[PDB]
Every structure is written in C-alpha cells, then in structure tokens.
Amino acid sequence: KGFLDCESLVALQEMALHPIDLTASGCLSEERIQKNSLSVEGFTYSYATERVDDRCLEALQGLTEERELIKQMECMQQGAIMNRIEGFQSESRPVLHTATRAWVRDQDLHEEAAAIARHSKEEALRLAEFLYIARAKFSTLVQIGIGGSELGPKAMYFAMQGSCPSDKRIFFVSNIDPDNAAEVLREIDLEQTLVVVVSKSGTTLEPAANEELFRQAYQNKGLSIAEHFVAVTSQGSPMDDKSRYLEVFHLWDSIGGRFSATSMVGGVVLGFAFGYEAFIEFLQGAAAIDAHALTPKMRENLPLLSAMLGVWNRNLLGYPTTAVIPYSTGLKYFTAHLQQCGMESNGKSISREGKEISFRTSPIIWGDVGTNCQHSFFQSLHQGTDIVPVEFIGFLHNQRGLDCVLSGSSSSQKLFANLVAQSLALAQGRDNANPNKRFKGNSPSSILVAQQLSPRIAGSLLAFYEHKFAFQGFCWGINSFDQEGVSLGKELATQIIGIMSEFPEARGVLRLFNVLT
C-alpha cells in the first residue's frame, strides 16, 4: 500500500486539522514531559514540544506498520537491492553502509552484506597497520574530495576534535575553486603532509583537478611525490592504483557517498587525527544505533520516531523546512552534512515504482549552532510568518574541560538551559498587549541530549540521522540511495569543459557568457 493509500495516513489527515495547542495553559504538564520522551543508547529524546498527542502517535505507529518500515530497514541492512527503480534503467544495487561497521559487534550477515563486513574489517586492520607508521612520519593531513567524500568526514573530525588529544593539522580541499587549494597550500609543510585523495568513482573533476594541483606543488618543491599521496576509492576504480599512491584504501559500490563516513572515507582522516582506537569507538557508536533501529515500536526507536515526527511536520502539518540546531561547538559542521544526507537522499519526486508522486518529500534542511542562533534567525522562528520545526541537539557536559562558575552556574549549564528555555518558549509563546512583543508559539521542536560528545556518541548521532532519512524514504516509497541530479551536475561539468576546449545548455551558456564578461 503506497504512502497516501494507507489507512493510518487517512486517520492522520483528520488529526492534522486540529493539532494539539501547545500554548494552552497547563498543556506542557509533568505527565506529558515524562510520557513523550525516550532515553536509550546514551541519549534522551523529548518531544513534548511537538504538536502530537496520543491519538496522533498511535496512528503514526500504524503508519510504520502499514508501510513496513522495520522490514525495509532489515532488508537494507541484510543486503537486499534497495537502490533501484522498477520499470526503468537505474543503479540496481544493495545499500550497505551499515555493513562497514557491523563487524565490530557479532552479527549474522549473509551474501553481499557479509562480504562488505569482512572487507571493511580487512580494510580497518590495514588502516591500523598504516597509521602506526603514518602518524609517526606526518604532522599534516589534507583530504582532497567533495560532497560525500568531504562533508561527513569533516563533520566527524570537528565533532571529535574536543575529545581526542591530537597535534595533527587537518585540512579539506574540495571546491574546484583553486582558492581553496591555495589557502591550504599557504599553510602546510609539504614534506610533513600526507595527501589523502578520496573519490569513490575516481573520476570526479574536483578531486582530480585538486590532486593535480598538489602533485605539481610537490614537484615544484622538488619532493618525491608518490610517497605523500594516499587514495581512497571504489575497488577496481581508475584510481585503485598502488603504483600511483603510497597506499590505497577501498570502499565499494553499495556504499553511498553521503553514507560513507564510517568507511575508509572517514577512517583515514579520523584515524590519522585521533589514532585507530578512536575510529573504532566511532564505529561502535554507529553499529549500536544500526542494531537499535530494528526496534519495532516507534515510541521505543530513536531514528524511527524522529522520522515519523518529521513526516508529521512535513506532510501532515505542511512545514517545508527543518532547522537542526546543535548547542555544540564540536557539531559546527554537522548540519551541513545532514543537509546533504537528507536532501540528496530524499529530494526526489518519483516512487521506487517509477510513478510521479503527489506529495512532498525532503524538506529544506538548514540550521546553525546555539546559542548564536538565538541572536540571529531565531527572530523569525519566534515572530516571523512561517513555522519552522526545530531539532535541538545538546549535551550536559563540554568536551574540552574548560569552564567557569558565574552567578552559581557553569557555562555548560547556561548552554543547556538556553536550549531548554527556547524550545519551551517556541512551543508555548507569550501573550502581550504590545503586538511587537507577543509570541504566538505553537512552533514545534524536539530535544536530543547525550552526556558528552565523544567518538562513540558522534558515531551514534551520525547513524541516527542516516536511519532517520532512510525511514522517511521507506515511508514515502522513494529511492533514497541514488542521485540523478548530482550525476547531471557532473555531466554538465564534463560538457562545459568540452565547450571551453551539441548539449541543451550550449546556445544558452554562450550568450550568458557574453553578457557576464
């Protein structure tokens, strides 16, 4: 039964007419604050500030059943062909980023999923061997890569920077804009630098242009070049070449780029920065959420609940965006990665059966950290014309151990308290005789908290959102795991290269070129 044809969706459309009024006096009771929460796998998740009541949550639970979300999650994790469009040409392959960490806890994986799990284990032990030497010889790592090859690793590197002692200097060169390469080359000692070229296909324009820029810089300084370059690419890729790289690590075709941070795409840079054992802790955190995401009761399942609350906000209440708001300096780059992972996966408008859909899929994912956000665009959340649902992320304790007692509390406490106060304020609002000072409220939010950001918790948070977006795709019935819009971008890049050294831009591009130059 397709998305719109499920009985539970029909019930939810009636409920969406009159969602609970979070501004009614006494609505945010102790009972509701206790009931609408879940504490498991090192987190507490509170959603008393979402516009949901027990009737709504029973039907959302029915929706997960009618759409068989748990069965699809198993199928994905066990190795079924989830990346495909029936009736038409498509990639037609499994979706196996969970298998890149499944091997750190005993599991019964078969066929393609088992092969990915054992190859990941073989890669990781090759990484441990490699890092013993590399962390002794190099002070500096430069990751060349774009999209899924940069954002996940970069978000995870800054997430862990506060927990793991390290003297390594770490840079990311991604844009074909050569100013990106120049800013990094300005800063580094090449003799001390390990360059990690990360490209699944091995053929993306940006890593290839950037790698060539760095190869020339080594040759200009008169340094042996191959001794400094490591590749991370798909097996059998044009880049899978041990005569051109000091070492070569592999992912595989069933490892989506935007899901590859737990593969060697993240393993090399994270392992070099913080040491092997920290990367394993990161993997254990992800694998623990992989196992938890099979929990059948929505109310007892973090990614499944977050997915269905998102579906409530997006399709039933009609809000076209979601703001992710981490109260966490370490998570400064996490929203940018989530924005790719959610919008690239679920920014689709055809079903896995090839039919054009009549509902909306991925919302715009955007956001920034607190408390900074309270001084800027929170103005519009509190008093603008459009409701923006918020996902707050916070921690009870800082990573780096520096804090200060002022007026009876530490700044870690002030940080968390600000998050709580804003969620309550967004949900309840404030009357006022002055219209300039009134707050209508009923702007929904959830709160996810762990004790402290760590490698393990970073891994759990990553896997949490990976499965949230997968569950939303499974519910919508779309293919979350290809990206024909991004393939088109790479094809445009090939053609504009040929045009500057036929296709439907050419006549347009030429005339634009004349008016802009």
Ligand X SMILES: O=C[C@H](O)[C@@H](O)[C@H](O)[C@H](O)COP(=O)(O)O
Q: Is 344 known to be catalytic?
A: yes
Say which entry of a copy of itself, ligand X, none residue 422 contacts (CB below 5 to 8 A, set by partner kind).
Answer: a copy of itself
Please tell me whether residue 351 adopts helix, strand or coil conformation: strand
CB 459 within 8 A of CB 43: no
Q: Binding residues for a copy of itself, how many (CB under 8 A)?
A: 152
Contact set for a copy of itself, span 259-318 (CB under 8 A): none
- The structure tokens 């054009």 sit at 356
Token pair in block for residue 356: 């054009």
Q: Which of 121, 332, 414, 490 is catalytic?
A: 490
Contacts of 216 (CB under 8 A, 6+ apart): none
Q: Give the residue from 37, 43, 41, 40 showing the smallest Cα distance to 450.
A: 43
Say which entry of ligand X, a copy of itself, none residue 201 contacts (CB below 5 to 8 A, set by partner kind).
Answer: ligand X
Under the binding rule (CB under 8 A), the answer on residue 24 touching a copy of itself is no
Phi, psi torsion values for 439, nearest 5 degrees = -130, 115
Under the binding rule (CB under 8 A), the answer on residue 18 touching a copy of itself is no
Please tell me whether residue 93 adopts helix, strand or coil conformation: strand
Say which entry of ligand X, a copy of itself, none residue 199 contacts (CB below 5 to 8 A, set by partner kind).
Answer: ligand X
Q: Which of 18, 30, 375, 502 is catalytic?
A: 375
Helix (H) or strand (E) holding 449: strand 445-452
CA 398, 322, 10 angle in degrees (round to 5)?
130
State the minimum distance, in angstroms, from the CB of residue 327 to a copy of itself.
7
Residue nearest to ligand X (CB): 147
Under the binding rule (CB under 8 A), the answer on residue 151 touching a copy of itself is yes
Under the binding rule (CB under 8 A), the answer on residue 106 touching a copy of itself is no
Q: Which of 91, 211, 344, 466 is catalytic?
A: 344
State the minimum distance, in angstroms, from the CB of residue 395 to a copy of itself.
9
Residue from 33, 40, 125, 133 touching a copy of itself (CB under 8 A): that is: 33
Residue 235: Cβ within 10 Å count:
12
Residue from 143, 174, 306, 472 touching a copy of itself (CB under 8 A): that is: 174
The CA distance from 306 to 311, in Å, is 9
Q: Give the residue from 41, 39, 40, 475 showing the smallest Cα distance to 287.
A: 41
Say which entry of a copy of itself, ligand X, none residue 256 contacts (CB below 5 to 8 A, set by partner kind).
Answer: ligand X
Residue from 362, 445, 460, 472 touching a copy of itself (CB under 8 A): that is: 362
State the minimum distance, in angstroms, from the CB of residue 40 to a copy of itself.
13
Residue from 100, 180, 233, 446 touching a copy of itself (CB under 8 A): that is: 180
- The structure tokens 């284990």 sit at 121
Residue 484: Cβ within 10 Å count:
13
CB 403 within 8 A of CB 410: yes
Stretch of 55-63, 107-115, 232-240, 350-358 contacting a copy of itself, by CB under 8 A: 350-358
Under the binding rule (CB under 8 A), the answer on residue 327 touching a copy of itself is yes
Is 207 or 477 the residue whose CB approaches ligand X more closely? 207
Under the binding rule (CB under 8 A), the answer on residue 374 touching a copy of itself is yes
Q: Is 86 known to be catalytic?
A: no
Concatenate the DSSP letters of all residues of 146-204 into one string: -GGGTHHHHHHHHHHTTTS----EEEEE--SSHHHHHHHHTT--GGGEEEEEE-SSS--
Whole-number CA gyration radius for the chain: 24
State the minimum distance, in angstroms, from the CB of residue 174 to ligand X.
9
Is 340 or 454 the residue whose CB approaches ligand X more closely? 340
Q: Is 250 known to be catalytic?
A: no
Q: Say if strands 390-397 and 321-326 run parallel, antiparallel, or are unpaired.
A: parallel
Say which entry of ligand X, a copy of itself, none residue 16 contacts (CB below 5 to 8 A, set by partner kind).
Answer: none
Binding positions for ligand X, rule: CB under 6 A:
146-149, 199-201, 204, 207, 256-258, 375-376, 483, 486
Token pair in block for residue 39: 């504490």
The residues assigned a catalytic role are: 344, 375, 490
